[PDB]
Curated annotation (Swiss-Prot):
Annotated protein name in UniProt: Troponin C, skeletal muscle
Protein source organism: Gallus gallus
The encoding gene: TNNC2
Record family assignment: Belongs to the troponin C family.
Entries under InterPro entries matching the protein: CALM/Myosin/TropC-like, EF-hand-dom_pair, EF_Hand_1_Ca_BS, EF_hand_dom
Superkingdom of origin organism: Eukaryota
Cellular component, GO annotation: troponin complex
């Protein structure tokens, strides 16, 4: 189900570009990625992840229950990857209305304890508002973050 949909999402032209990043993780070879091969690719950049930690990273990807990472698993993973900003976007609007208000952000900035000035906070919103509506929406939130 997921594969039959993520597959139609990217045609062979897109899949080709995705294959470039797939071959990097496939430093040892084979047509699929594994937990051991993952840690090897992480250290290639300079990161030192844990084996058991990386094993859990694949467990989440194994929705059906494969064990290792496959090429189509890598494609569906890219297919399911703005939710990140959507979560932060909602965290800013404590009222849950759809947009962030200046009054909502005011306390959020002061809540940190830092000594910020309202002249700086107010001017920041006036400069970030390209259309000048008063509140911040998910549209402007994209360039905002």
């Amino acid at each position: 189900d997921q594969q039959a949909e993520a597959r139609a999402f990217l045609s062979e032209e897109m899949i080709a570009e995705f294959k470039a990043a797939f071959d990097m993780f496939d430093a040892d070879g084979g047509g699929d990625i594994s937990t051991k091969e993952l840690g090897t690719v992480m250290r290639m950049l300079g990161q030192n992840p844990t084996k058991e930690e990386l094993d859990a990273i694949i467990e989440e990807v194994d929705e059906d229950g494969s064990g290792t990472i496959d090429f189509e698993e890598f494609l569906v993973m890219m297919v399911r990857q703005e939710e990140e900003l959507a979560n932060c976007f909602r965290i800013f609007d404590k009222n849950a209305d759809g947009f962030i208000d200046i009054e909502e952000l005011g306390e959020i900035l002061r809540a940190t304890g830092e000594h910020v000035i309202e002249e700086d906070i107010e001017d920041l919103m006036k400069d970030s508002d390209k259309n000048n509506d008063g509140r911040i929406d998910f549209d402007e939130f994209l360039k905002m973050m």
